[PDB]
Amino acid sequence: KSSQDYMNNELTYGAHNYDPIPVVLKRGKGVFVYDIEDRRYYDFLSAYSSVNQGHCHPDILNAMINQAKKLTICSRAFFSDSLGVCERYLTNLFGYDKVLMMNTGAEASETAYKLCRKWGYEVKKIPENSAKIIVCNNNFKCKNNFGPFVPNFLKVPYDDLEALEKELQDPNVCAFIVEPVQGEAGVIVPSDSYFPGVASLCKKYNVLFVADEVQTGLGRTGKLLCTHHYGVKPDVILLGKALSGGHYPISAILANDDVMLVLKPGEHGSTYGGNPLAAAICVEALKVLINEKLCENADKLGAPFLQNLKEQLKDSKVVREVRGKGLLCAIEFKNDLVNVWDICLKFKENGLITRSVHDKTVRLTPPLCITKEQLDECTEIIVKTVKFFDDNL
Amino acid sequence: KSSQDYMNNELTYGAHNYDPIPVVLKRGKGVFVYDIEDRRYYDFLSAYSSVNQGHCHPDILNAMINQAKKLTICSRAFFSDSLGVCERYLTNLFGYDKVLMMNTGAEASETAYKLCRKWGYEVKKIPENSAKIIVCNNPNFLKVPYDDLEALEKELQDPNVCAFIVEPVQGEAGVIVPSDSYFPGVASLCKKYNVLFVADEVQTGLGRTGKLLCTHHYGVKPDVILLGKALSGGHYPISAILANDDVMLVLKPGEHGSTYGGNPLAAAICVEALKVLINEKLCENADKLGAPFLQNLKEQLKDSKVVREVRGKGLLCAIEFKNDLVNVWDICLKFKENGLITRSVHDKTVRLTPPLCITKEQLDECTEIIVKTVKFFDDNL
């Protein structure tokens, strides 16, 4: 069987709900993945930050096996030894009274909305009929906006304190939920000064500052929390992805007692949320992150890589911009001139796989254990692949 | 550290969003779990059907380790060898064109709603922004009584309905079994009004009632199947939707986004979990031991003042109490004391769902525990 046998097999037995780059992987180790035909590629997506520690990290796999021999799941009908150990681990490590463990990052966001709204009722006296959470324009009037007839989410521009303050004036806002750097918007970094302002603004209007660190956290930008960079402490933290080194779906919300204690019991979530197996894996995944100093590696190698790449592409007709912080980087192209999807196929050909976002911005997010030498080899691949297209206009 | 230490620890570091029975488990094997103090209990919840195969089943753990050494996740940005093998396995096994893999059962339900609505437009050609879906008691949803063909047909008449989503036996409602005749009628009715018959088999499926699909009992083939829980033997969150091409192709690329859905690690675990289910003939075990256990239990409790009813099919059973007379929660604590753990539902119905590898002898020992527990509450009234 060949890569193609597999790709056809999937098309005929599975739903067509995804549109993958045509490579079929069978193995990962650290910063490399390997296809059906034993070709090797640099993984520059890291399963969207789930394998910050690197593919198939042995320590984590170990933790997983030690737990899975004892107990894999018992459900929230009862207690496990493992979950508490995790909860205590995470809380001490991030400096929050409590933590709530879950599976997917969506579960994290949903639960966060419930949380903010209820805190808004129980504490700030706002009616759930009328509670609003501010978010940002992941991209960029006539509308009932008053009392019970309200949007649920108010969108405002990212990196915009004036606009943010304008909405915070609404007494029915209970929360601003924001990413330390916008992933989906194409890796948009904020001005150093934004988050400091955000923290003040929220403090002042008595509104929960929630930071979505599902992509930006756990080493990706150089720190355990990207928000650590701007010296601000959010009221609520969302964690996920790299929280497990790709060995399990695990995500979390962190908050102090005054926020977390708004949550009433009996309200069902997922059966697998907070299971012993995940709890064990979680602690090891973060222990690996800290012991191997992967945060610092990222911090040290990141700014250079980005700067040097900015240099070597300064004279490209198709490149629009090169952005990043730590090892969370991207290249935005002028989709007027090039087809972003082809650039991704070209990369794949040149030995580095990644994916598009907007059909204009390409994600550059390798596992955090990458070496200076490896990054240099990749800069070569990147400069070369971009050359290919520049050489057609 | 003791059970209590462990519980207090959770209270102070984790959110209080659940309300567990006060037992702290450290280990599972098959039908038994063991607490901090090395006490042993019969697990009669099976993590709500996630461990049909039994706790910590070795074959599955093996499958898990073989895969985890090779690749755990790459995301849907790319392909893995393992996923396709899974997809092909499941499809052949259940008799549907395609399958869509996911993580949680909620993801399955959400995705099912999207699917039904979209089929309802790109096919039944329902007016945009108006596709209603019918569901059973317990904005574009219509509730109707369970086990009610007359009521069901009345709603099916709405030309804007695109789907009926229903459980082969109602779990949350307190283990409610339908009359043999209901589902056959359901299938006809849906066939006639041109409406997707979706079966939620997340709890009822994979051996729990004696068959791979509980609907197999009633000789009906649903347009869509939802699977989960036992789909992994409790080793990972894995769930699925099954459907043929005419329904499934409605879904187009790039509209969704859960990173872990369809990952290679889960894909591998899935195939083994079901292989275990079939090889160890756990469906049949459940089928054979089930009806007896339920009948015999009905007998031994016929004269109880606090028991209201004993229901079940296969090893999916329950006992409903008269919450006027007893506190269901205390009945659960008493069980725990007598060596069998389980949970309440409604504060009136108690779930009896052991792992499917339980033996006739074991069930008998449990019947004893159950009867003993019950008598304690009879006398004391």
From Swiss-Prot, chain A:
The UniProt entry's coiled-coil ranges are none
For the protein in the UniProt heading, the enzyme class is transferase
Q: What does this protein do?
A: The enzyme has a very narrow substrate specificity and can only catalyze the transamination of alpha-ketoglutarate with ornithine or N-acetylornithine and, to a lesser extent, of glutamate-5-semialdehyde with glutamate and alanine.
Q: Which cofactor does it need?
A: pyridoxal 5'-phosphate
Q: Which organism is it from?
A: Plasmodium falciparum (isolate 3D7)
Similarity remark:
Belongs to the class-III pyridoxal-phosphate-dependent aminotransferase family.
Query: What UniProt keywords apply to this chain's record, in alphabetical order?
Result: Aminotransferase, Cytoplasm, Disulfide bond, Pyridoxal phosphate, Transferase
Result for mutant: residue 329 to S: About 70% reduction in catalytic activity. Does not affect TRX1-mediated activation
Q: What is this protein called?
A: Ornithine aminotransferase
Q: Which Pfam families does the record match to this protein?
A: Aminotran_3 (PF00202)
Its quaternary organisation is: Homodimer.
Q: What is its EC number?
A: 2.6.1.13
Q: From the Swiss-Prot or TrEMBL record, what is one GO molecular function term? A: pyridoxal phosphate binding
Record SUPFAM superfamilies: PLP-dependent transferases (SSF53383)
Q: Which reaction does it catalyse?
A: a 2-oxocarboxylate + L-ornithine = L-glutamate 5-semialdehyde + an L-alpha-amino acid; L-ornithine + 2-oxoglutarate = L-glutamate 5-semialdehyde + L-glutamate
UniProtKB/Swiss-Prot annotation, chain B:
Matches recorded under InterPro entries: Aminotrans_3, Aminotrans_3_PPA_site, Class-III_PLP-dep_AT, Orn_aminotrans, PyrdxlP-dep_Trfase, PyrdxlP-dep_Trfase_major, PyrdxlP-dep_Trfase_small
Q: Which domain of life is it from?
A: Eukaryota
User: Is this entry keyworded Cytoplasm?
Assistant: yes
Mechanisms controlling activity: Binding to TRX1 may also induce conformational changes that facilitate substrate binding.
Instruction: Quote the subcellular location field of this record.
Output: Cytoplasm
Pfam families named in the record: Aminotran_3
At what positions is N6-(pyridoxal phosphate)lysine found? 229
Q: What is its EC number?
A: 2.6.1.13
| Catalysed reactions listed for this entry | a 2-oxocarboxylate + L-ornithine = L-glutamate 5-semialdehyde + an L-alpha-amino acid; L-ornithine + 2-oxoglutarate = L-glutamate 5-semialdehyde + L-glutamate
Named cofactor requirement(s): pyridoxal 5'-phosphate
Q: What class of enzyme is it?
A: transferase
Q: Which GO terms describe its cellular component?
A: cytoplasm
Keywords recorded for this protein, A-Z:
Aminotransferase, Cytoplasm, Disulfide bond, Pyridoxal phosphate, Transferase
NCBIfam families (alphabetical): Orn_aminotrans (TIGR01885)
Q: Which family does it belong to?
A: Belongs to the class-III pyridoxal-phosphate-dependent aminotransferase family.
- What protein is this chain from? Ornithine aminotransferase
